[PDB]
Design an enzyme around this catalytic site. Structure first.
Site, mmCIF file in Angstrom:
data_model
loop_
_atom_site.group_PDB
_atom_site.id
_atom_site.type_symbol
_atom_site.label_atom_id
_atom_site.label_comp_id
_atom_site.label_asym_id
_atom_site.label_seq_id
_atom_site.Cartn_x
_atom_site.Cartn_y
_atom_site.Cartn_z
ATOM 1 N N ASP A 21 -17.095 16.412 -4.632
ATOM 2 C CA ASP A 21 -16.735 16.437 -6.077
ATOM 3 C C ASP A 21 -15.216 16.552 -6.220
ATOM 4 O O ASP A 21 -14.703 16.849 -7.281
ATOM 5 C CB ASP A 21 -17.402 17.640 -6.746
ATOM 6 N N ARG A 35 -12.253 16.157 -10.572
ATOM 7 C CA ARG A 35 -13.504 16.846 -10.153
ATOM 8 C C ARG A 35 -14.686 16.304 -10.959
ATOM 9 O O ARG A 35 -14.685 16.328 -12.174
ATOM 10 C CB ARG A 35 -13.364 18.349 -10.402
ATOM 11 N N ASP A 40 -22.030 19.381 -9.005
ATOM 12 C CA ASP A 40 -21.433 20.358 -8.053
ATOM 13 C C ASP A 40 -21.943 20.066 -6.640
ATOM 14 O O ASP A 40 -23.106 19.774 -6.438
ATOM 15 C CB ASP A 40 -21.838 21.778 -8.457
ATOM 16 N N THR A 41 -21.083 20.143 -5.661
ATOM 17 C CA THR A 41 -21.522 19.869 -4.264
ATOM 18 C C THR A 41 -22.230 21.106 -3.704
ATOM 19 O O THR A 41 -22.120 22.184 -4.253
ATOM 20 C CB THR A 41 -20.303 19.544 -3.396
ATOM 21 N N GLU A 43 -21.795 23.439 -1.541
ATOM 22 C CA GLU A 43 -20.868 24.230 -0.683
ATOM 23 C C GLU A 43 -20.262 23.322 0.390
ATOM 24 O O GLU A 43 -20.830 23.130 1.447
ATOM 25 C CB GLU A 43 -21.641 25.367 -0.011
ATOM 26 N N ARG A 87 -6.846 20.607 -12.708
ATOM 27 C CA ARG A 87 -7.635 19.444 -12.216
ATOM 28 C C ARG A 87 -8.005 18.543 -13.395
ATOM 29 O O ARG A 87 -8.238 19.006 -14.494
ATOM 30 C CB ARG A 87 -8.916 19.944 -11.544
#
Ligand SMILES: Cc1cn([C@H]2C[C@H](OP(=O)(O)O)[C@@H](COP(=O)(O)O)O2)c(=O)[nH]c1=O
Length: 149
Positions: A21, A35, A40-41, A43, A87
């Site tokens: 991301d 982003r 959301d990735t 981790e 970002r």
């Protein structure tokens, strides 16, 4: 776009992808990081040996992705255009397709970080995430925290 209507779609130039991301592109001619919004990735801090699970998978997924895309665009939502980390928040489109959707398609990034009013594309990413669950794409494989070392 001679006039303003919904969001502000603009061109972008891929520069160096870091995480799934997180991808630094070129906006206005200057270097900047973007982003994926509403996603959301799993981790991907990649500290050293990685978790040995979803470490080296999502980051590269978007890497070769936008790396082979013929064009890269971004769509800032109606909310703020930058977070507290400086970002840029927007939707990256590769080949006229929603990259964020591609991630949810390979079950590499789940919907997360939803804060109004930045959530216009939360509906498409919602039904998409559900499809990834039935598709069992990596993250949507097992379901428990035991026997995983
Ligand atoms: C994407 C996004 C992140 N954030 C905040 C929550 C998280 O704070 P923390 O930095 O304290 O974790 C951080 C996550 O961004 P990333 O998804 O880029 O990691 O940015 C928002 O408040 N709204 C958003 O739309």
């Amino acid at each position: 776009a001679t006039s303003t209507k919904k969001l502000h779609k603009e061109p972008a130039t891929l520069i160096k992808a870091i995480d799934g991301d997180t991808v630094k592109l070129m906006y206005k001619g200057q270097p900047m990081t973007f982003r994926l919004l509403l996603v959301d990735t799993p981790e991907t801090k990649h500290p050293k040996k990685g978790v040995e699970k979803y470490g080296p998978e999502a980051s590269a997924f978007t890497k070769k992705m936008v790396e082979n895309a013929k064009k890269i665009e971004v769509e800032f939502d109606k909310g703020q255009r930058t977070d507290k980390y400086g970002r840029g928040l927007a939707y990256i489109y590769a080949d006229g397709k929603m990259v964020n959707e591609a991630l949810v398609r390979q079950g590499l990034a789940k919907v997360a970080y939803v804060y109004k009013p930045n959530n216009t594309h939360e509906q498409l990413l919602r039904k998409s995430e559900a499809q990834a669950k039935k598709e069992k794409l990596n993250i949507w494989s097992e379901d428990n925290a035991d026997s995983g070392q």
